[PDB]
Amino acid sequence: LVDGFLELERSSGKLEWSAILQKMASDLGFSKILFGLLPKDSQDYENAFIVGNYPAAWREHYDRAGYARVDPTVSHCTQSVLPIFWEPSIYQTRKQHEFFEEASAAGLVYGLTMPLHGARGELGALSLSVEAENRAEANRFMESVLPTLWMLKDYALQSGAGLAFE
Amino acid sequence: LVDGFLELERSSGKLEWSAILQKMASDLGFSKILFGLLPKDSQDYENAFIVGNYPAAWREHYDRAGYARVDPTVSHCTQSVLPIFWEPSIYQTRKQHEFFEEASAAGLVYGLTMPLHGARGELGALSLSVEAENRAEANRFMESVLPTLWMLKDYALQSGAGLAFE
Numbered sequence: 001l002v003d004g005f006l007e008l009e010r011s012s013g014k015l016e017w018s019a020i021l022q023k024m025a026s027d028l029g030f031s032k033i034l035f036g037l038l039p040k041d042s043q044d045y046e047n048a049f050i051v052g053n054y055p056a057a058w059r060e061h062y063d064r065a066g067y068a069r070v071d072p073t074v075s076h077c078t079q080s081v082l083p084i085f086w087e088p089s090i091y092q093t094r095k096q097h098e099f100f101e102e103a104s105a106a107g108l109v110y111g112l113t114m115p116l117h118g119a120r121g122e123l124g125a126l127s128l129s130v131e132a133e134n135r136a137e138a139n140r141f142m143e144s145v146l147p148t149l150w151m152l153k154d155y156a157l158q159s160g161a162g163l164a165f166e
Numbered sequence: 167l168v169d170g171f172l173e174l175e176r177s178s179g180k181l182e183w184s185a186i187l188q189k190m191a192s193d194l195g196f197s198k199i200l201f202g203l204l205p206k207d208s209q210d211y212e213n214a215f216i217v218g219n220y221p222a223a224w225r226e227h228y229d230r231a232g233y234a235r236v237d238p239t240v241s242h243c244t245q246s247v248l249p250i251f252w253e254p255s256i257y258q259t260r261k262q263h264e265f266f267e268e269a270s271a272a273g274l275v276y277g278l279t280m281p282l283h284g285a286r287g288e289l290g291a292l293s294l295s296v297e298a299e300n301r302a303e304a305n306r307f308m309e310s311v312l313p314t315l316w317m318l319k320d321y322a323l324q325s326g327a328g329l330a331f332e
């Protein structure tokens with residue numbers, strides 16, 4: 001993990017940094033990731049530093065639909081430092097239901113979001129999806145790697161913030 | 167850990183919450199802790215919300231000597247979300263050397279500080295010291311529990327920010 005952080009901090013460019021972070025997620029056993037970060041006092045959710053390998057057409061749709069205002073992981077990130085697991089119970093509103101359905105059609109069904117709060121007031125999220133036969137298998141996988149992930153998100157936040165905002 | 171968090175969340179008052187957080191640290195192998203938290207925007211280190219079992223007279227001395235402007239873990243917390251271990255190389259200025267020597271006379275020589283950055287802009291530190299026979303042993307210990315500690319500091323922040331400012 002620390003060697004991963006060192007590779008992140010020796011990377012030259014957004015593309016390289018993204019490739020290293022994706023590989024670190026993938027080595028941990030996740031399949032898709034999205035690292036998103038805004039500068040301090042921005043909720044300008046389109047003009048964020050966004051990196052990872054979610055389907056391009058899903059990312060476009062998420063912006064066009066205004067899903068930053070619906071996605072329950074986003075409001076959760078504004079209120080907590082703790083992870084929020086993509087459980088059926090987090091989708092409550094009708095819009096949140098439609099969100100779940102469309103993300104699911106995008107292959108994003110099981111996973112978690114780690115909120116990111118940087119030392120200069122950066123606000124973000126690291127979301128990671130997992131391929132699994134069922135939610136039970138998914139949840140067990142995520143519990144087995146949660147301590148590594150919890151360290152990873154802070155190493156990603158610290159390196160990423162310097163890359164995004166220099 | 168999560169049970170520990172749920173206990174913190176069910177607790178009433180600063181006293182019970184302290185006792186729970188101290189026991190969680192002690193169970194993990196650390197003898198002394200300080201959990202320190204400021205509201206958004208404050209740089210008022212002497213009126214920080216403070217919990218733990220550091221010797222009272224060391225806390226008094228820190229306040230009276232203005233060590234918040236000296237203590238190298240404090241500048242680090244303002245810049246980073248990553249832990250900072252109490253290695254001799256972090257003490258660089260003459261005043262920093264005096265601070266190392268005085269902290270050490272208090273029994274606070276081996277340890278680390280986890281920066282705390284909350285979702286409403288709270289700024290803090292969870293410092294934990296370890297009673298070991300020497301620094302080599304303390305560092306072995308701390309490496310072996312680091313991933314638990316890294317999740318712990320965030321649960322403590324999420325619960326304790328409520329306790330401090332809500």
Ligand SMILES: O=C(Oc1c(Br)cc(Br)cc1CNC(=O)c1ccccc1[N+](=O)[O-])c1ccccc1
Pocket residue numbers: 034035036037038045048050054058059062068071073074077086103108113123124125127
């Ligand atoms: O990255 C952020 O949000 C974004 C941005 Br923007 C674009 C996109 Br696409 C996605 C997110 C975060 N949500 C998720 O990853 C997520 C969560 C639960 C179920 C399904 C999804 N999903 O998208 O498949 C973000 C940045 C700063 C602050 C808060 C959020």
Ligand SMILES: O=C(Oc1c(Br)cc(Br)cc1CNC(=O)c1ccccc1[N+](=O)[O-])c1ccccc1
Pocket residue numbers: 200201202203204211212214220224225228234237239240243252269274279289290291293
């Ligand atoms: O609590 C904070 O700082 C405080 C406050 Br105030 C009072 C006191 Br006493 C201590 C700290 C934090 N330093 C340490 O724990 C520390 C670090 C390295 C070696 C020795 C010690 N030590 O003190 O024995 C704090 C709060 C917000 C942001 C940064 C720091």
